[PDB]
Write a protein that binds this DNA or RNA. Sequence first.
RNA 1: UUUUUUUUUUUUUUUUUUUUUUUUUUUUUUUUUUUUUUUUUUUUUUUUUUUUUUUUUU
RNA 2: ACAGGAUCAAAUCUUCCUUGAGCGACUCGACAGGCAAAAAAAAAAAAAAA
Lengths: 120, 158, 57, 466, 662
Amino acid sequence: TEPISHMQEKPATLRLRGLPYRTTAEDIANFFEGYSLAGPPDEAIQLHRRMDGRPTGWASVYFESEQEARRAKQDKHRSYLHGRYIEIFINFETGELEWIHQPQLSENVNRKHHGKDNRG
Amino acid sequence: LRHRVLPSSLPNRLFSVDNRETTRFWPPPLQKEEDERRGAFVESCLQPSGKASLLQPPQCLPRAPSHLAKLMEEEERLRLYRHLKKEERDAATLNKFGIWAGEPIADTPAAKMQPLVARTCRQTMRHLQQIEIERLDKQRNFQVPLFGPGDLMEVKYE
Amino acid sequence: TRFFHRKRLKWLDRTRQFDYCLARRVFKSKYEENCRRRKIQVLQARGASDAVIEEAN
Amino acid sequence: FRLIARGIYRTAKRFINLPRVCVYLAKLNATGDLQDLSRFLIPQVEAYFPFQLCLLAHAFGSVRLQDKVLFAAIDEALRPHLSELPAAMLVKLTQGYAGALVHNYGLLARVSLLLQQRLSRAATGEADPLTKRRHSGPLLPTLHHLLAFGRVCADLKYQDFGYLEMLSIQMQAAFRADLAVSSSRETFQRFSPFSVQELVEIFHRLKVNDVSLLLAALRHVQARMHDYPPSCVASIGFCTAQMLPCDASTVRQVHAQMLEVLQEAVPLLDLCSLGQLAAFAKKAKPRRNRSALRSSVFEAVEARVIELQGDGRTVFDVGRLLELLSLNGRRVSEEAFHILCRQAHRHLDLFEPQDFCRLARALARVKCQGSRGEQSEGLQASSLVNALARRTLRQEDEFSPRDFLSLLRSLTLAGPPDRVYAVPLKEKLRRKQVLHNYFPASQSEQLLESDLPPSSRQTPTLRKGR
Amino acid sequence: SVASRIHFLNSRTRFQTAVHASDVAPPFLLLPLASPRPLLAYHHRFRTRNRKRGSRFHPHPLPLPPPPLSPPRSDAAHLFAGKPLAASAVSTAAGQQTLPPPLLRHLQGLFPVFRGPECDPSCGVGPAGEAAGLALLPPPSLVEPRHLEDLARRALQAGACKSDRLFWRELAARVEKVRDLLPIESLVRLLTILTLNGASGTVRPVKQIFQAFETQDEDNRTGLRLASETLPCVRPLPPRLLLASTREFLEDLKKLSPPATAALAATFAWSNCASSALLFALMERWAWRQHLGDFTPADFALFVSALGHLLSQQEATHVKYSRQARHLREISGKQIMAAFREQKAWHFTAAFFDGCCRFMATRAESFSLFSFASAARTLVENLDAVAACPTPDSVEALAKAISLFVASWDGGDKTHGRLATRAANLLLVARLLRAASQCELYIHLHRALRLEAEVDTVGACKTLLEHISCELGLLHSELEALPLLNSRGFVHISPDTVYVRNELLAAAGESAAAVVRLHHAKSLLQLSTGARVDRVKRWMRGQQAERMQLETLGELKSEAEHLADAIDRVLRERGAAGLPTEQLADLMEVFALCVGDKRVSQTPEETLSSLQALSSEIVRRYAALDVNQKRRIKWATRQMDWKDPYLNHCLGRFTAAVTRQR
RNA sequence: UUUUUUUUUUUUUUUUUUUUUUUUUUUUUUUUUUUUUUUUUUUUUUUUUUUUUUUUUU
RNA sequence: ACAGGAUCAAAUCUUCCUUGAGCGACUCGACAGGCAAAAAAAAAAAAAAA
């Protein structure tokens, strides 16, 4: 079986953030217990690190199918791990060009007559 | 009767890191380091006695007297060869262009391959005061007594 | 990469090795195939029938 | 022409067909520029065509310019294309290496087997797949190509018994087929009188005694005697004499007839051919009257030498010639000796360590005979002696100690050189002796200012004049 | 070195002898010892001054497809022409554009240009013209260290298709860069895969003993395939790789399993590269324990063979450099003046050899013909006859092993398959015979020399001579005929047949050597012992001595006669142009031995004929033979009263070490 | 050119089959400092300007 | 550049001539660096590895 990296079509995958320093493949594999993964831990779990080998706190986890992915997401959302809760996010698009639909920009703004805020 | 070929001199003229003929001994100071290190490694690796050095990671090298003696020969040969080649090139260069690369004459950061910094400047300045103090202390024929504010003293000067 | 590619292209051209029409056809075919696959997969995502898919594309 | 050269150099990188200039340069003898072009040539080795590569290599090789960097690259590049190039291109590629003296036995081996397989295919009656539409040459080789390659091999010192085996067979068959011709119109079709010469030369150079082949060749020569130029015969005989036993009843018969023609045809011979003639005559073992043969040969060659005084292009074994002419107490004519001496100066660049010794011994034997005419001390060549001495001293690291000793002795006996060349030799001899532990039983200073040349102005001496 | 090249150029007697194209081998190289290189690290700083200003994914150059043989069309209207194009041509014409399998399949149903033999619709075409498997893999450069072994193994399973060179070159480079990150065991497998790719489908030399794999039938009358592209003269692995990898093994030598060590030694051997440090380290680790026993019969042979092959050359090279070392040293004038005034085979550890011997002895029956032969022939190299040195016990062990093996051998079980395989088996049997011959001579000489101061081998030996006599006779008739030197217009000469012919002739020469040596071996037996020894030394050195007799053979006389008849029959119909150069004298000697007390063998031996052909070869090759051989021949000929105008011309006018002395 | 006589035994042969030293197609290897923080990289420009060609000398 | 050429031919180490002045000198040919982050009296200080 070829590695995921070399595959011509990536399967369903998720994204994890806010991980501690003391993190390994086995920790995520045990975290994700009772769910069908795309392969063994070395292939399904992929840690994120820079050139200096410093973990960025980000991780990617594969799944057999989108249904399993979503079920694991919903069942593991905000789950404690080493004293910190992990945030699970979707890592795949639907295919529709939803980005075309944009909000209507304001045409009448008065900073001088509005409450201060840090909104972008 | 035979015709003599014309070896190409382009390797001796091309100056770049890619060409080894013109960069085998690029750094005058660091070229010696290689030699020194090599000698230390060979001396401390090729002649075991029972005490383990902590210079480099362990290696599964032979320990038989005959094998070590055999190795030594090779070592010697390579040393000799390198010496001869450097001599040759030096001579050639000197003869042609007259370029000379002598040893350092003074202790300078340039010698050490370091830039010039205010930090260094300050360091040197402090050193100079140190030495000056040391020197001046010697000339005196008396020891400075301990004193402080509000203490009556009598100075004597020429 | 663009600059080195362009230089290699020029060399190829001078060497009579490069085919303009062939490159254009390959380019257009790849773009059209990607566009077609996008729509086919979008239609299949809704669970439509084979007859509906065939009639749509 | 400097203008053009400079411009070319300047605009080198803009040349699409860079190799196209190399061939021109090599023909014009532009070594300097050709050398320079190498800088830009190397990087684009992988871009050029296989036939372009071979032309590049041949152009490089023609000028006697060794470029290992370039050659290696070329070789590497031509790896997958060597099995599809034509015979002529392979020949030129090998010649390229040959010229530069690049001992590439790996390449040689490859090419050798390719030629063999091609020849086999040809023999099988197979057509030629590869072949102003005639742009590329044929794929299958021929006898000329074979010979060409053989010469290359000889040059490069590559004793290929397997190749030679095939070659011999093919040559033998060609000889046999040619001897069966009925009319002169179909004679010398697949080969000319000049090809057997080449063959012989190859075989001689390689130091391979092929009796089966030599004899065969000899037979055909004997047959078509009248069709071979004197020069060809001269060479052939010279070559054959030093390999085959002259006492054999087979070769003797041939030699005898060869010599007879040669003697008549001597006037149309050059220096090179005269030397060979002399050698051959010497090596001959006739059954009949023998004394007159040598005498006749010598008396003729001597005469022709004089007429050939104005020759400055040809290359010959002057030393050998002079030695030959001074055998068994034979006295050399003064004119001839002076001519030879004169002519023996331009060759010193090509003179081998053995040549040096040869020449030295010939001069020493010439002087050892005694007085002759007005010359009370006998014939001497001081100008030659001094040049020999100087070149010998410069090339100190090319003589065996045994040869060196003899050389020194010879030089000493033949008009001892100047002090400046005499002194250092003493030191070098001692050094050599010490080094090699050479102390034959038969064996049993400091240079000063005054000894230096006057013209050099190395002394604190003020002279008058301008 | 300038003076040394000038001497070779000016030399008129030194040549490159080669009976066949395949005989030539790559030059031997001796790698140095590793050491810290601070200067190279400083130089590396100048190679990464603008990396921040470059591509972060593809900073390295792009590979170029190989060029075509003939120039392209004038107008480059490849699409309009409609003719099929190769993978490289399509790649180069489409702007090096990727053609995945779907796109290629769609385009093939629209144009015929893509309907080429290499344009596989189920594999696609790579950027660089890659196809047929390599197109389905990513660039080697981009593959992580952890995924290198699998990539190489998968690729290995994949003037046609010239684009694989790029992929393999990239792989090679990658390995080197990632050397210091890969498992020590996986490194060896990667090197073996690269060597397999670089030497797939090759033929070993005729005179070579060591061989990676055993020749087998492949699914031409002979069935052998030759190609100049895959010539053994070509080095599989660049020295760079080996050099780089050298250090790795030194650090983790204890972590290598016996199968990995055998593969490492075989790779080194195949590459022709050597390392003293490594060699010694491997030698000093393995030993017999009352552990070499862990090695299997197949791996043991290879490990021994490789080691020996390397060591021989190592020693040889050492010897050569020893003498060249003299001139580099400086000498002062005072030393010169003082000098003027005054002038007025063992390349194996004992323990290792013993262990090997014991191993062989203990598991003789577990070995096969090829392995056994290979192992035996290697170990016999140390045993010589001039007289640390191995022991009689050690030699006896190997003798016993040989005996056992011979007794337990089946004697052919493949039903006489391909002719090349049968010839190789015959040569292996001859090798075995050779080994057997040498052991006895060493033992006997030792004993006889030692005695002065103060195992049934022949029974097993007798069968090999009969088997060789039968097999050589069968194969001579089964092989096709070829022209003889001695006797479209072109002679048909297939290069593929001379190879097997030379193999058969080499086996015959081996047997002739062995039987010759046996004579001495036997003759050494109790004239005084010293006298006997002297006689044997005379014989071996090529000196005036007593005439050689055949009766001393005794039980082996009939087998010797049969062998002589077999070689006579072979040479009477196949000339003497395929005989080995290193065993020429033996073939002469064996006939001199046969000429004694004769009844009818005088007429067949002349004294075209075998003798004549032999002479014809001798004369031909006189420029290659050694002084030992020349003296031996000179005496042998005299013995038999062989008169030849040609041979006598060369025996007295073309050498100085023999003719210019008495 | 047979019989016979004379000279020469790796030291000087009536002469280079001739005496010495091929690394040869390959002289090829990443140092120091460093408990812990921060920008380590994000983007673009640049070399073929010829008539490749009068296609590679059977 | 000892690169080319002449001569009855050079101390080791080119007797003499040509290269217009060997492209003003050296050097490079994947050569060279505008903008951003950070730092920043001029100026200097970062090897590559998300």
